[PDB]
Amino acid sequence: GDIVSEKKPATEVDPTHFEKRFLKRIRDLGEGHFGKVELCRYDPEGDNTGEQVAVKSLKPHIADLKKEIEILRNLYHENIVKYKGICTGIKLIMEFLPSGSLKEYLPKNKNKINLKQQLKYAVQICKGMDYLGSRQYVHRDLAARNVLVESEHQVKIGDFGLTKAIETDKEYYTVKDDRDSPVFWYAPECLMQSKFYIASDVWSFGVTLHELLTYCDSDSSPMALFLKMIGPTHGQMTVTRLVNTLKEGKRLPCPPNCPDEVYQLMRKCWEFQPSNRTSFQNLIEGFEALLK
Numbered sequence: 001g002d003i004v005s006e007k008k009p010a011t012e013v014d015p016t017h018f019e020k021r022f023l024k025r026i027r028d029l030g031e032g033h034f035g036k037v038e039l040c041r042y043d044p045e046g047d048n049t050g051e052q053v054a055v056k057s058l059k060p061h062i063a064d065l066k067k068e069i070e071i072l073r074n075l076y077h078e079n080i081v082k083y084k085g086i087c088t089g090i091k092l093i094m095e096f097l098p099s100g101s102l103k104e105y106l107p108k109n110k111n112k113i114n115l116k117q118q119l120k121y122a123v124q125i126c127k128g129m130d131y132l133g134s135r136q137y138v139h140r141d142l143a144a145r146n147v148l149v150e151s152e153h154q155v156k157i158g159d160f161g162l163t164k165a166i167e168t169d170k171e172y173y174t175v176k177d178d179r180d181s182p183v184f185w186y187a188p189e190c191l192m193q194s195k196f197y198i199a200s201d202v203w204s205f206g207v208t209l210h211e212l213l214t215y216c217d218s219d220s221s222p223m224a225l226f227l228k229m230i231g232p233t234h235g236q237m238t239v240t241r242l243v244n245t246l247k248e249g250k251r252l253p254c255p256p257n258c259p260d261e262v263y264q265l266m267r268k269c270w271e272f273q274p275s276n277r278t279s280f281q282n283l284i285e286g287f288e289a290l291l292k
């Protein structure tokens with residue numbers, strides 16, 4: 001008799017599924033060598049009223065992006081950027097923070113952001129990082145460019161492209177791809193043996209705190225300052241030159257107008273040996289003591 005077809009199941013909406021046809025690119029926000037993030041509007045009504053979102057996609061590594069999505073999808077913390085969903089190849093949809101990262105926000109808001117507010121941001125970054133460490137992750141890319149500004153009073157860790165799980169009962173993750181490491185943010189064990197501990201993120205945090213205290217000025221950046229300390233024309237010998245400097249005991253200097261008590265907390269992040277470094281919880285205590 002009549003053509004047979006399939007009875008249609010009632011289709012619910014998944015609020016975490018973003019349809020490609022409604023996701024409209026506004027502009028680039030940032031990138032790496034394999035990934036990039038764009039500002040889009042998700043505009044199903046087509047009248048430019050939809051919400052703005054940050055969209056992370058691959059540059060023309062799918063497995064790594066899917067792993068990043070699964071990591072972020074399951075992080076819930078006020079100082080970690082919010083997962084919104086996916087668009088499926090696959091794109092990661094996150095909340096968009098108009099102020100951008102500390103690199104964008106700090107140079108423009110020096111007058112508004114005093115030492116007290118910097119310390120509160122420092123606490124917030126530590127709380128986010130301590131949460132990540134409690135989920136048994138190492139971030140491996142903690143720098144001011146990856147700290148987003150939600151408001152004058154709040155920051156969030158805003159990218160997880162290099163984040164890796166540390167195996168249960170084990171203490172570090174060993175890295176293989178290292179061609180694009182942010183070496184001027186990396187602890188010695190990372191630079192020398194390619195091992196990543198939670199203590200390695202504490203080291204990076206120290207450097208990120210330096211950036212925050214210098215309002216992310218490009219002439220005071222950890223790279224600029226290190227290249228001054230070791231020489232800017234060593235090419236492929238740069239990292240060995242860096243490693244030796246750190247071995248000698250040389251560190252980034254105290255930022256202008258940074259009180260010594262703040263600088264001492266920073267130096268505890270940079271004990272040459274991972275086991276000798278401060279923890280994120282102890283940093284929080286330290287900053288809070290300075291705020292009260």
Ligand SMILES: C[C@@H](O)c1nc2cnc3[nH]ccc3c2n1[C@H]1CC[C@H](CCC#N)CC1
Pocket residue numbers: 029030031032035036037054081094095096097098099100101104145146148158159161
């Ligand atoms: C301006 C730029 O720093 C920026 N503004 C953002 C606003 N909302 C966002 N939500 C998620 C990221 C994000 C944002 N990012 C950058 C943060 C760092 C990443 C780095 C990883 C890549 N690609 C690029 C986008």
